[PDB]
Scaffold this active site. Sequence first.
Site, PDB file in Angstrom:
ATOM      1  N   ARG A  45      55.405  41.657  38.611  1.00  0.00           N
ATOM      2  CA  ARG A  45      56.548  40.981  38.017  1.00  0.00           C
ATOM      3  C   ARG A  45      56.136  39.987  36.920  1.00  0.00           C
ATOM      4  O   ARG A  45      56.797  39.800  35.901  1.00  0.00           O
ATOM      5  CB  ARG A  45      57.287  40.278  39.112  1.00  0.00           C
ATOM      6  CG  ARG A  45      58.658  39.813  38.562  1.00  0.00           C
ATOM      7  CD  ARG A  45      59.438  38.890  39.520  1.00  0.00           C
ATOM      8  NE  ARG A  45      60.556  38.249  38.855  1.00  0.00           N
ATOM      9  CZ  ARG A  45      60.916  36.990  39.135  1.00  0.00           C
ATOM     10  NH1 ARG A  45      60.298  36.214  40.050  1.00  0.00           N
ATOM     11  NH2 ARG A  45      61.925  36.483  38.461  1.00  0.00           N
ATOM     12  N   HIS A  49      57.359  40.147  33.131  1.00  0.00           N
ATOM     13  CA  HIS A  49      58.100  39.043  32.511  1.00  0.00           C
ATOM     14  C   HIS A  49      57.481  38.409  31.254  1.00  0.00           C
ATOM     15  O   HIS A  49      58.203  37.952  30.355  1.00  0.00           O
ATOM     16  CB  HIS A  49      58.337  37.955  33.540  1.00  0.00           C
ATOM     17  CG  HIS A  49      59.620  38.136  34.365  1.00  0.00           C
ATOM     18  ND1 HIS A  49      60.617  37.267  34.630  1.00  0.00           N
ATOM     19  CD2 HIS A  49      59.989  39.299  34.990  1.00  0.00           C
ATOM     20  CE1 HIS A  49      61.528  37.844  35.354  1.00  0.00           C
ATOM     21  NE2 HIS A  49      61.143  39.069  35.566  1.00  0.00           N
ATOM     22  N   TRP A 188      63.524  46.323  48.661  1.00  0.00           N
ATOM     23  CA  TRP A 188      64.061  47.588  48.200  1.00  0.00           C
ATOM     24  C   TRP A 188      63.735  48.731  49.127  1.00  0.00           C
ATOM     25  O   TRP A 188      64.425  49.759  49.181  1.00  0.00           O
ATOM     26  CB  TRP A 188      63.533  47.942  46.814  1.00  0.00           C
ATOM     27  CG  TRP A 188      64.190  47.047  45.766  1.00  0.00           C
ATOM     28  CD1 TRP A 188      65.425  47.356  45.234  1.00  0.00           C
ATOM     29  CD2 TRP A 188      63.682  45.848  45.313  1.00  0.00           C
ATOM     30  NE1 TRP A 188      65.722  46.340  44.459  1.00  0.00           N
ATOM     31  CE2 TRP A 188      64.711  45.433  44.466  1.00  0.00           C
ATOM     32  CE3 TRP A 188      62.460  45.199  45.346  1.00  0.00           C
ATOM     33  CZ2 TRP A 188      64.508  44.346  43.635  1.00  0.00           C
ATOM     34  CZ3 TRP A 188      62.269  44.115  44.516  1.00  0.00           C
ATOM     35  CH2 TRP A 188      63.276  43.695  43.676  1.00  0.00           C
TER      36      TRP A 188
HETATM   37  C1  HEM Z   1      66.913  45.539  34.285  1.00  0.00           C
HETATM   38  C2  HEM Z   1      65.603  45.250  34.800  1.00  0.00           C
HETATM   39  C3  HEM Z   1      65.249  44.384  35.838  1.00  0.00           C
HETATM   40  C4  HEM Z   1      65.997  43.422  36.523  1.00  0.00           C
HETATM   41  C5  HEM Z   1      67.479  43.059  36.416  1.00  0.00           C
HETATM   42  C6  HEM Z   1      65.093  42.875  37.436  1.00  0.00           C
HETATM   43  C7  HEM Z   1      65.385  41.847  38.342  1.00  0.00           C
HETATM   44  C8  HEM Z   1      64.598  41.388  39.399  1.00  0.00           C
HETATM   45  C9  HEM Z   1      64.984  40.431  40.313  1.00  0.00           C
HETATM   46  C10 HEM Z   1      66.343  39.751  40.357  1.00  0.00           C
HETATM   47  C11 HEM Z   1      63.893  40.282  41.175  1.00  0.00           C
HETATM   48  C12 HEM Z   1      63.749  39.393  42.394  1.00  0.00           C
HETATM   49  C13 HEM Z   1      63.124  38.055  42.117  1.00  0.00           C
HETATM   50  C14 HEM Z   1      63.046  37.136  43.330  1.00  0.00           C
HETATM   51  O1  HEM Z   1      64.077  36.797  43.906  1.00  0.00           O
HETATM   52  O2  HEM Z   1      61.958  36.709  43.709  1.00  0.00           O
HETATM   53  C15 HEM Z   1      62.955  41.196  40.756  1.00  0.00           C
HETATM   54  C16 HEM Z   1      61.710  41.411  41.381  1.00  0.00           C
HETATM   55  C17 HEM Z   1      60.660  42.275  41.023  1.00  0.00           C
HETATM   56  N1  HEM Z   1      60.659  43.010  39.909  1.00  0.00           N
HETATM   57 FE1  HEM Z   1      62.322  43.304  38.699  1.00  0.00          FE
HETATM   58  N2  HEM Z   1      63.920  43.510  37.407  1.00  0.00           N
HETATM   59  C18 HEM Z   1      63.978  44.380  36.417  1.00  0.00           C
HETATM   60  C19 HEM Z   1      62.893  45.166  36.013  1.00  0.00           C
HETATM   61  C20 HEM Z   1      61.578  45.219  36.472  1.00  0.00           C
HETATM   62  C21 HEM Z   1      60.564  45.966  35.884  1.00  0.00           C
HETATM   63  C22 HEM Z   1      60.729  46.879  34.639  1.00  0.00           C
HETATM   64  C23 HEM Z   1      59.420  45.615  36.637  1.00  0.00           C
HETATM   65  C24 HEM Z   1      58.075  45.960  36.504  1.00  0.00           C
HETATM   66  C25 HEM Z   1      57.499  46.964  35.608  1.00  0.00           C
HETATM   67  C26 HEM Z   1      59.861  44.818  37.686  1.00  0.00           C
HETATM   68  C27 HEM Z   1      59.071  44.400  38.779  1.00  0.00           C
HETATM   69  C28 HEM Z   1      59.457  43.602  39.845  1.00  0.00           C
HETATM   70  C29 HEM Z   1      58.725  43.374  40.997  1.00  0.00           C
HETATM   71  C30 HEM Z   1      57.471  44.056  41.488  1.00  0.00           C
HETATM   72  C31 HEM Z   1      59.491  42.493  41.746  1.00  0.00           C
HETATM   73  C32 HEM Z   1      59.104  41.904  43.103  1.00  0.00           C
HETATM   74  C33 HEM Z   1      58.555  40.513  42.929  1.00  0.00           C
HETATM   75  C34 HEM Z   1      58.282  39.727  44.191  1.00  0.00           C
HETATM   76  O3  HEM Z   1      58.206  40.262  45.285  1.00  0.00           O
HETATM   77  O4  HEM Z   1      58.128  38.528  44.086  1.00  0.00           O
HETATM   78  N3  HEM Z   1      61.148  44.512  37.524  1.00  0.00           N
HETATM   79  N4  HEM Z   1      63.387  41.853  39.673  1.00  0.00           N
END
Ligand code: HEM
EC number: 1.11.1.5
Length: 291
Positions: A45, A49, A188
């Site tokens: 993430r 970002h 997820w």
């Molecule tokens: C429209 C695109 C995306 C949206 C709206 C989005 C949104 C989010 C949100 C809301 C979280 C949770 C954050 C938290 O509460 O800690 C999250 C987690 C995460 N996202 Fe996305 N995301 C998007 C795309 C992506 C992409 C393209 C990647 C990586 C190539 C990604 C990788 C991750 C990973 C691995 C997490 C887990 C992080 C953790 O466990 O702390 N995301 N994302």
Amino acid sequence: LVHVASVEKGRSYEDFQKVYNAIALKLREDDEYDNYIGYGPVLVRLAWHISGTWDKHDNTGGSYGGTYRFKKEFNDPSNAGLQNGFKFLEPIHKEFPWISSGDLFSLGGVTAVQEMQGPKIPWRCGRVDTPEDTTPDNGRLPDADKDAGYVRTFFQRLNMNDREVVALMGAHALGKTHLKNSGYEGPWGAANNVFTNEFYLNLLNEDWKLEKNDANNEQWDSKSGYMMLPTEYSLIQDPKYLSIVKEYANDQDKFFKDFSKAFEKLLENGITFPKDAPSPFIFKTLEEQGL
Ligand code: HEM
């Protein structure tokens, strides 16, 4: 705006492989984090970002500058929770003071994915730290409460087409949402620190019901305890996106091969690589090295 990749002076493959080994050995060691998910998910993430701020129109943002190190982007509401991945990498940066910031943030992403049994991601070094004033303004990262129309138009700024967007989305098999970081709560899937195509199989196979969560946001919850955000749920409501989700649900190798291409494109957007620059490095995992 042109950003030219400059290899850290005198550094070569073996040096970068030592930074990778250091990040990977510490992933192993700190397995307690986030209820035993470990820091691998917050690191991919973090690499998405710092890369996701790019604008193709004027070449600003993107991984090059390492500007997350500055307060404006460090304190972006969209980046809540990423402070944990930053604090992980800091002892590694102290250990290897010569590596640039954007190089370390991005390589951490590559390391997390390859150590969580995902595909090899080619990585290129050469990002140069730029000044506090090249730091992008907040608001360039995507909303979670939207539809496939938003998704297509948003990813077009980083010139990602449909396939790259769906391939990139599957990194959501990893880790979870956390109510305090984003107003959303829940995994997820079940294997959330192993890289698989689980995201697509869940999106297609669960009986998802729309519910409001404790932060008053809608999310799709399933009987197994899983969740899906409004934005990524609409990837089964769009005819073109849905055909790709079904492709990846059915074929993991394909997903890994596509994911590898799209994540590297994501991490190099905005960067010009001179003809003489070193080729992409394919880093060995600890396992491959017997470590
Ligand atoms: C429209 C695109 C995306 C949206 C709206 C989005 C949104 C989010 C949100 C809301 C979280 C949770 C954050 C938290 O509460 O800690 C999250 C987690 C995460 N996202 Fe996305 N995301 C998007 C795309 C992506 C992409 C393209 C990647 C990586 C190539 C990604 C990788 C991750 C990973 C691995 C997490 C887990 C992080 C953790 O466990 O702390 N995301 N994302």
